[PDB]
Amino acid sequence: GIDPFTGEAIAKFNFNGDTQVEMSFRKGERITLLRQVDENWYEGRIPGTSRQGIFPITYVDVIKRPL
């Protein structure tokens, strides 16, 4: 995201979020990484949209980690 403390990732694969906290996306989307919340999950959002939530790290190519 524009805040340099946030990170950036590109989705490698489609991700369907099954629960209300998850954020679905398709392969190729750019995602702002807000925080790595455990060994397998990020919290993130897609700027320009209201889309926000958690997703698994295995679905994205992390370009820049949050600070």
Side-chain angles (χ1 to χ4, degrees):
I2 201 63
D3 175 351
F5 289 78
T6 64
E8 298 281 359
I10 301 291
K12 292 168 59 182
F13 317 115
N14 288 2
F15 172 63
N16 282 168
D18 294 336
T19 61
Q20 286 188 33
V21 293
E22 299 171 82
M23 176 180 68
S24 306
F25 52 77
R26 288 178 70 79
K27 167 180 182 193
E29 299 195 71
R30 178 177 169 181
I31 299 165
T32 288
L33 301 182
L34 298 164
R35 199 176 182 86
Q36 191 172 344
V37 295
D38 71 6
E39 72 286 5
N40 300 323
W41 293 81
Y42 266 107
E43 192 189 46
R45 68 186 206 89
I46 296 171
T49 79
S50 301
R51 301 163 62 204
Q52 185 271 4
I54 64 174
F55 55 88
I57 306 180
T58 48
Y59 285 74
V60 309
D61 187 11
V62 174
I63 305 308
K64 180 168 82 190
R65 291 185 297 271
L67 286 215

